[PDB]
Amino acid sequence: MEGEHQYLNLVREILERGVKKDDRTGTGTLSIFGPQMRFSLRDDTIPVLTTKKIFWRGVVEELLWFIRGNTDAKELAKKKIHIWNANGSREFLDSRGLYDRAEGDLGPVYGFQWRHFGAEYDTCSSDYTGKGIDQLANILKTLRENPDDRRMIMTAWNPMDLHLMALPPCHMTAQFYVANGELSCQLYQRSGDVGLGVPFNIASYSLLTHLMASMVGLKPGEFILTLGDAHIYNTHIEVLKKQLCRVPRPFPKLRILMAPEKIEDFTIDMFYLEGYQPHSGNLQMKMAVLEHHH
């Protein structure tokens, strides 16, 4: 089934057939390996879940921060995006043997790889202009000049750099593909928290694909998310069973007002979501209170 049903069906598969495993800290999960979801980006569609409210402004500011090749959690915190703060904290960096790292300095995580792959990392505020392999720039050019290319790979998976990172990347490799004037993206995510990180990854990479299509005169096509270890934390099970009861509404549309000459110069003002109408869950809570009584 299409659209949001690909996500809900994944949740159900893990609840019903997942294996009882443990993570790094010994907290309980249900787990399967290798599932895939596919989302249309046609007719301006952007797969932002309707069965719960996604933090859209967080999706955008994180993605633009990636695109700039930035790695300072403090720059997101200034925009009131706090999702990277815990990974940049003194305690977290210390637990990874990053004793000489300033608070907020995540190291060469996603963005740095996207724009500066193979460069030597100094701090999150050093000037990395023309350093390393600009994977994202290379793909944009290839999309303009030779869109049939089968090597349009962007990876954050550098085994030399993993020990310098707050955490090893999980949305780790993407491939782009063009057919009939349409740009598709597949993401390989080795580890996906299906209750929390995965809905965010779907919105984030779908947005990246709409933005990249802008840059290169193509239309958006599909976003494919392929997972390694797809898991649900035991603490989320009950909330996710209630989410599965909620009928999806149509996905919102992304409206782009302009595209700048360089993709790192996108600002949040240049595009918006039209028709985003997520569940609040109030009607379901009312029916639970009413049904209990009978």
CB of 20 to a second copy, least distance (A): 9
Given a contact cutoff of 8 angstroms between Cβ atoms, the answer to whether 278 and 54 are in contact is yes
Residue 190 annotated as binding?
yes
148 binds a second copy (CB under 8 A): yes
**Of residues 177-196, those binding a second copy (CB under 8 A):** 177, 179-180, 184, 186, 188, 190-191
Torsion angles phi and psi, residue 52, rounded to 5: -150, 160
Closest-CA residue to 140 (of 42, 262, 258, 36):
262
Q: How far apart are CA 204 and CA 61, in angstroms?
A: 10
Q: 218-248: buried (b, 16+ CB within 10 Å) or exposed (e) per residue?
A: bebbbbbbbbbbbbbbeebbeebeebeebeb
SS3 category, 65:
helix
Q: How far apart are CA 89 and CA 229, in angstroms?
A: 26
Residue 245 annotated as binding?
no
Select from 27-35, 78-86, 91-99, 273-281 the region that touches a second copy (CB under 8 A): 27-35
- Whichever of 64 and 216 has its CB closer to a second copy, that residue is 216
Residues whose CB falls within 8 Å of the CB of residue 82, separated by 6 or more in sequence, listed in order = 76
- Over the window 232 to 271, marking each residue x when it contacts a second copy by CB under 8 A and - when it does not, the resulting string is ----------------------------------------
CB of 151 to a second copy, least distance (A): 5
- Whichever of 85 and 155 has its CB closer to a second copy, that residue is 155
Q: How far apart are CA 198 and CA 15, in angstroms?
A: 15
- Over the window 49 to 88, marking each residue x when it contacts a second copy by CB under 8 A and - when it does not, the resulting string is ----------------------------------------
CB of 58 to a second copy, least distance (A): 23
The letter for the amino acid at 73 is: A
Residue found under tokens 């997942």: 18
- Whichever of 60 and 224 has its CB closer to a second copy, that residue is 224
Is-catalytic flag, 185?
Answer: no
122 binds a second copy (CB under 8 A): no
Q: How far apart are CA 246 and CA 239, in angstroms?
A: 11
DSSP-derived pairing of the beta strands 153-155 and 219-233: unpaired
The letter for the amino acid at 149 is: D
Q: How far apart are CA 223 and CA 226, in angstroms?
A: 10
User: Which residue among 9, 27, 36, 235 contacts a second copy (CB under 8 A)?
Assistant: 36
User: Site residues (CB under 8 A) for a second copy?
Assistant: 19, 21-23, 31, 33-34, 36, 38, 117-118, 133, 135, 148, 150-151, 153, 155, 157, 159-160, 168, 170, 172-173, 175, 177, 179-180, 184, 186, 188, 190-191, 222, 224, 226, 228-229
Q: Which residues are annotated as a binding site?
A: 24, 150-151, 170, 190-191, 193, 201, 231, 233
- Binding-site entries for dUMP: 24, 150-151, 170, 190-191, 193, 201, 231, 233
Q: Which residues are catalytic?
A: 170
